[PDB]
Amino acid sequence: ADKPDLGEINSFDKAKLKKTETQEKNTLPTKETIEQEKQAK
- In angstroms, the CA 22 to CA 15 distance is 11
> What approach was used to elucidate this structure?
NMR
CA distance 17 to 23: 9
Question: Which residues fall within 8 angstroms of residue 28, CB to CB, at 6 or more apart?
Answer: 35
Give the three-class secondary structure for 14: helix
Each domain of the chain, given as residue ranges in start order, spans: 1-41
Cα distance between residue 7 and residue 41, in whole Å:
46
Residue environment code for 10-36, b if the CB has 16+ CB neighbours within 10 A, otherwise e? eeeeeeeeeeeeeeeeeeeeeeeeeee
CATH code given to domain 1-41: 1.20.5.520
HSE, CB side, 13 Å, CA atoms: give it for residue 4.
Answer: 3
Residue 10, amino acid: N
Residues 24, 28: Cα–Cα separation, whole Å? 6
- What residue spans of 1-41 are helical by DSSP H? 5-27, 32-40
Q: How far apart are CA 16 and CA 40, in angstroms?
A: 30
